[PDB]
Amino acid sequence: RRANALQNELEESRTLLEQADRGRRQAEQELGDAHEQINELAAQATSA
Amino acid sequence: RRANALQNELEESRTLLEQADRGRRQAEQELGDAHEQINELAAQATSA
């Protein structure tokens, strides 16, 4: 009964573990498009 | 045998998750690092 108990916890946690996997992949994308833009304005900044 | 065998991997799964969401706070504070940078660099760029 304990061996079936933690199985209920794991499939609970695996869904939570894949939740942050959908979190950081869009989170660094918000870092990603910004860090592309910090190239673009700064190249304009030394040009201006 | 199994009851300890899933015991370690739950301690392995969550410590991946507890290391995963630490990555997101690493990301979001860097978005805070970029957003102040995209403000101050533009403030030079708009005056030019």
Calculate the dihedral angle through the C-alpha atoms of B1, B6, B8, B9, rounding to the nearest 10 degrees. 150
Instruction: Give CA–CA dist B4/A3, Å, rounded.
Output: 9
Helix, strand, or coil (residue A1): coil
Do residue A20 and residue B16 have CB atoms under 8 angstroms apart?
no
3-class SS shares of chain B: helix, strand, coil, % to 5: 95, 0, 5
Q: Which long-range contacts (CB under 8 A, 24 or more apart) does B26-35 make?
A: B27/A24, B27/A27, B27/A28, B27/A30, B27/A31, B28/A27, B30/A31, B31/A27, B31/A30, B31/A31, B31/A34, B34/A31, B34/A34, B34/A35, B34/A38, B35/A34
Residues of A in contact with B34 (CB under 8 A): 31, 34-35, 38
Residues of B in CB contact (< 8 Å) with A are 2-3, 6-7, 9-10, 13-14, 16-17, 20-21, 23-24, 27-28, 30-31, 34-35, 37-38, 41-42, 44-45, 48
Contacts of B23 in chain A (CB under 8 A): 24
Nearest to A37 among B7, B10, B38 (CB): B38
Do A13 and B10 meet the contact criterion of CB atoms below 8 Å apart?
A: yes
Residue A4, class by beta-carbon neighbours within 10 Å (0-12 exposed, 13-18 middle, 19+ buried)? exposed
| Closest among A44, A47, A6, A26 to B23, alpha carbons compared | A26
Alpha carbon distance B22, B13 (integer Å): 14
| B10, B42, B48 member nearest A10 (Cβ) | B10
**B2 CB burial (10 A radius; 0-12, 13-18, 19+):** exposed
